[PDB]
Amino acid sequence: KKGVVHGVATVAEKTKEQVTNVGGAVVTGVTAVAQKTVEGAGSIAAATGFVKKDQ
Amino acid sequence: KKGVVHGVATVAEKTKEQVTNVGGAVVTGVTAVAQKTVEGAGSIAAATGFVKKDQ
Amino acid sequence: KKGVVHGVATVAEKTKEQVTNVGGAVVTGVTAVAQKTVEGAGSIAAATGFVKKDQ
Amino acid sequence: KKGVVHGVATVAEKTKEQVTNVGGAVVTGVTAVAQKTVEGAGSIAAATGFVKKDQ
Amino acid sequence: KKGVVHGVATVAEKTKEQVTNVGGAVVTGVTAVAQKTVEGAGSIAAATGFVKKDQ
Amino acid sequence: KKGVVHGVATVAEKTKEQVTNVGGAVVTGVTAVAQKTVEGAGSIAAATGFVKKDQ
Amino acid sequence: KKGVVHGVATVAEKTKEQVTNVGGAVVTGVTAVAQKTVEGAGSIAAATGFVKKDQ
Amino acid sequence: KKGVVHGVATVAEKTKEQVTNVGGAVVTGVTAVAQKTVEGAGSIAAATGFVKKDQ
Amino acid sequence: KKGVVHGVATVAEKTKEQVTNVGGAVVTGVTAVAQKTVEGAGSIAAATGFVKKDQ
Amino acid sequence: KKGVVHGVATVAEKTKEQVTNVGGAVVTGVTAVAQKTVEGAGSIAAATGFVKKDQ
Ligand SMILES: CNc1ccc(C#C/C=C/c2nc3ccc(O)cc3s2)cn1
Numbered sequence A, B, C, D, E, F, G, H, I, J: 001k002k003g004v005v006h007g008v009a010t011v012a013e014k015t016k017e018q019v020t021n022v023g024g025a026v027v028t029g030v031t032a033v034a035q036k037t038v039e040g041a042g043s044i045a046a047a048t049g050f051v052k053k054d055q
């Protein structure tokens, strides 16, 4: 076989899960957050996949 | 087989799940948030997939 | 087989779920948010798939 | 088989769900939000798929 | 076989999970956060995959 | 002060919410159920406050 | 002060929430159920407060 | 002060929450269930407060 | 002070939370269940407070 | 002071939390369950407070 990509690719066979991202956010997984009190200014309480590039 | 992509591709066979994103947000997964009190200015309480690029 | 894409494609066979996004938001998954009090100015309380690019 | 796309495509066979988006928003999934009080100026309380590009 | 990529690629066969990211965040895994009180200004309470590049 | 009750009482001051029940059902709280398919014979799908005393 | 009860009482001061139950069910709290498919005969899918005393 | 109870009482001062139960079920707390597929005959999927006394 | 109870009592002062139960179930706490697939006959998947006295 | 109980009592002062139980189940605490697949016949997957007295 032959393949040429510029990116971003994701090429496969017999594949149970696939995610391609440029951005941005993708949530595909099981996630449970239980929480009782959030205070403070300002605290990232429960972050799973996170990116902060403030300018 | 032969394939040429510019991106972003996601090419496969026999594949249970697929996500392609440029952006942007995609939520495809099970997610449960239970929460009782959020305060503060300003706190990211429960973030799963998150991207902040303020300018 | 043969395939040429410019992107963004999502090409497959025998595939249970598919999402293609450029944007933008796509919500296809099970999601439960239970919440009791949100305060503060301004706090992202419960974000699942999120993108903030304010200029 | 043969396929040439400019994007955004989503090509498949035997496929239970499909979403193609350029925009924009698509909501196809089960979603339950229960909520008791939202305050503050201005806090994104419960966001599932979200994109904010204010200029 | 032959392959030439510019990156970022992810090329495979017989592959159970795949993630390609440029960004950005991708959450595909099981995650449980249980939490009782978050205070302080400002403390990253529970971060799993995290990136902070404030300027 | 003095108080004598036989029950069921609920005596208070400065009190935001009150429920007294003998029975019977009382629903006073925020509740959101989103649901896509219920089958089976016979399965309690989503029960919040529930009591079954069949004889 | 003086108090004599037979039960069930609930006596208080300065009290934000109160529930008295003999029965029976009382739902006063925030509750979110999101659900996609329930099958089987017969499975209690999502039960929060539950009591089964079949005879 | 003086108090004589037969039960079940709940006597207090300056008290934020109160529950008295004989039964029966009382749900006063924040609860989020997100769920994607329930099968089997018969499986208690997600039970929070639960009592089964079948005879 | 003086107190005589038969039970079940719960007597206090300056008390943030109170639960009295004979039964029966009481759910007053924050709870998040996220779940993707339940099978089998019959498996208690996610039980928090649970009592099974089948005869 | 003087106190005589038959049980079950719970007598206190200046007390943040109280639970009295005869039964039965009481859930007052923060709890997060995230789960991806449950199989088998029949396996207690995730049990927090649990009692099984089948006869
Ligand atoms: C009797 N039970 C009680 C009594 C008090 C409390 C409480 C509280 C939180 C207080 C906070 N103050 C600030 C001030 C500045 C800031 O940036 C963040 C915070 S959070 C809970 N239970």
Ligand SMILES: CNc1ccc(C#C/C=C/c2nc3ccc(O)cc3s2)cn1
Pocket (backbone or CB within 6 Å): A006, A007, A008, A022, B006, B007, B008, C007
């Ligand atoms: C002022 N600040 C900024 C911020 C971001 C940028 C940018 C950019 C370009 C992003 C691209 N992504 C892809 C993905 C796939 C593909 O095939 C081609 C491209 S080009 C410029 N200035």
Ligand SMILES: CNc1ccc(C#C/C=C/c2nc3ccc(O)cc3s2)cn1
Pocket (backbone or CB within 6 Å): A039, A041, B039, B040, B041, C040, H016
């Ligand atoms: C008797 N039970 C009670 C009594 C009080 C409370 C409470 C509270 C929260 C107070 C806050 N103050 C500020 C001030 C500034 C700011 O930026 C954020 C916050 S949050 C809960 N239960």
Ligand SMILES: CNc1ccc(C#C/C=C/c2nc3ccc(O)cc3s2)cn1
Pocket (backbone or CB within 6 Å): B006, B007, B008, B022, C006, C007, C008, D007
């Ligand atoms: C002022 N700030 C900004 C911010 C963003 C940008 C930008 C951009 C371009 C994004 C593109 N995405 C794709 C995706 C697929 C494809 O085949 C071609 C392209 S080109 C410029 N200035």
Ligand SMILES: CNc1ccc(C#C/C=C/c2nc3ccc(O)cc3s2)cn1
Pocket (backbone or CB within 6 Å): B039, B041, C039, C040, C041, G016
């Ligand atoms: C007796 N039970 C009670 C009594 C009081 C309360 C409460 C409260 C919240 C107070 C807040 N103050 C500010 C001030 C500034 C700001 O930016 C945000 C906030 S939130 C709850 N239960």
Ligand SMILES: CNc1ccc(C#C/C=C/c2nc3ccc(O)cc3s2)cn1
Pocket (backbone or CB within 6 Å): A042, A044, A052, B042, B044, C042, C043, C044, D042, D043, D044, E042, E044, E052
């Ligand atoms: C709706 N408008 C707004 C306004 C502001 C925001 C925000 C934010 C996040 C601020 C953070 N600061 C710190 C400092 C130190 C550290 O280690 C981690 C962090 S995260 C979101 N939306």
Ligand SMILES: CNc1ccc(C#C/C=C/c2nc3ccc(O)cc3s2)cn1
Pocket (backbone or CB within 6 Å): A001, A002, A003, A004, A005, A011, B001, B002, B003, B004, B005, B011, C002, C003, C004, C005, C011, D001, D002, D003, D004, D005, D011, E003, E011
């Ligand atoms: C109209 N219908 C269709 C049908 C098929 C297609 C397609 C395609 C792309 C196939 C590729 N295969 C490989 C293999 C290896 C590699 O490194 C890169 C690539 S890209 C589009 N439209």
Ligand SMILES: CNc1ccc(C#C/C=C/c2nc3ccc(O)cc3s2)cn1
Pocket (backbone or CB within 6 Å): C006, C007, C008, C022, D006, D007, D008
């Ligand atoms: C002032 N700020 C901004 C912000 C965004 C932009 C932009 C843009 C272009 C987006 C494109 N998306 C696609 C997707 C598929 C495709 O085949 C071609 C294209 S071109 C410019 N200025």
Ligand SMILES: CNc1ccc(C#C/C=C/c2nc3ccc(O)cc3s2)cn1
Pocket (backbone or CB within 6 Å): D006, D007, D008, D022
């Ligand atoms: C001032 N700000 C902005 C904001 C957005 C834009 C833009 C744009 C173009 C979007 C396109 N989408 C598609 C999708 C499919 C396709 O085949 C061709 C195209 S071109 C410009 N200025």
Ligand SMILES: CNc1ccc(C#C/C=C/c2nc3ccc(O)cc3s2)cn1
Pocket (backbone or CB within 6 Å): A039, A040, A041, E039, E040, E041
């Ligand atoms: C009687 N039970 C109680 C009594 C008090 C409390 C409490 C508390 C938290 C206080 C905080 N103060 C600050 C001040 C500045 C800051 O940046 C962060 C924080 S968090 C809990 N239980």
Ligand SMILES: CNc1ccc(C#C/C=C/c2nc3ccc(O)cc3s2)cn1
Pocket (backbone or CB within 6 Å): F006, F007, F008, G006, G007, G008, G022
């Ligand atoms: C055949 N099966 C059953 C089932 C239930 C019963 C029963 C009963 C009695 C329940 C009572 N509750 C209260 C509550 C308060 C009070 O002051 C007095 C009473 S007496 C009998 N047979």
Ligand SMILES: CNc1ccc(C#C/C=C/c2nc3ccc(O)cc3s2)cn1
Pocket (backbone or CB within 6 Å): F002, F003, F004, F005, G001, G002, G003, G004, G005, G011, H002, H003, H004, H005, H011, I001, I002, I003, I004, I005, I011, J001, J002, J003, J004, J005, J011
């Ligand atoms: C109508 N209003 C009221 C007012 C008060 C009451 C009451 C009461 C019970 C108080 C007790 N104190 C103690 C102290 C020590 C000990 O070992 C056992 C006990 S029992 C009922 N109804």
Ligand SMILES: CNc1ccc(C#C/C=C/c2nc3ccc(O)cc3s2)cn1
Pocket (backbone or CB within 6 Å): G006, G007, G008, H006, H007, H008, H022
């Ligand atoms: C055949 N099976 C069953 C099942 C249940 C029963 C029973 C019973 C009695 C329950 C009572 N609860 C209270 C609560 C408060 C109070 O002051 C007095 C009473 S008496 C009998 N047979």
Ligand SMILES: CNc1ccc(C#C/C=C/c2nc3ccc(O)cc3s2)cn1
Pocket (backbone or CB within 6 Å): D016, G039, G040, G041, H041
């Ligand atoms: C192509 N996508 C598909 C195809 C099939 C299905 C499905 C299904 C469920 C089948 C069941 N059979 C039984 C039999 C007996 C019983 O007691 C309970 C059940 S539930 C979902 N998506």
Ligand SMILES: CNc1ccc(C#C/C=C/c2nc3ccc(O)cc3s2)cn1
Pocket (backbone or CB within 6 Å): F042, F043, F044, G042, G043, G044, H042, H044, I042, I043, I044, I052, J042, J044, J052
């Ligand atoms: C609507 N009707 C019905 C009918 C049946 C049921 C039931 C049930 C539970 C059965 C269990 N068996 C086992 C065996 C072994 C073990 O370790 C744990 C458990 S839990 C509920 N509702």
Ligand SMILES: CNc1ccc(C#C/C=C/c2nc3ccc(O)cc3s2)cn1
Pocket (backbone or CB within 6 Å): G007, H006, H007, H008, I006, I007, I008, I022
């Ligand atoms: C056939 N099986 C069963 C099952 C249960 C029973 C029973 C019973 C009695 C329960 C009581 N609870 C309270 C609570 C408070 C109080 O002050 C007095 C009482 S008496 C009998 N037979």
Ligand SMILES: CNc1ccc(C#C/C=C/c2nc3ccc(O)cc3s2)cn1
Pocket (backbone or CB within 6 Å): C016, G040, H039, H040, H041, I041
């Ligand atoms: C192609 N995607 C697919 C294909 C098939 C399925 C499925 C399924 C479930 C099958 C079950 N069979 C039984 C039989 C007896 C019983 O008591 C319970 C169950 S549950 C999901 N996705």
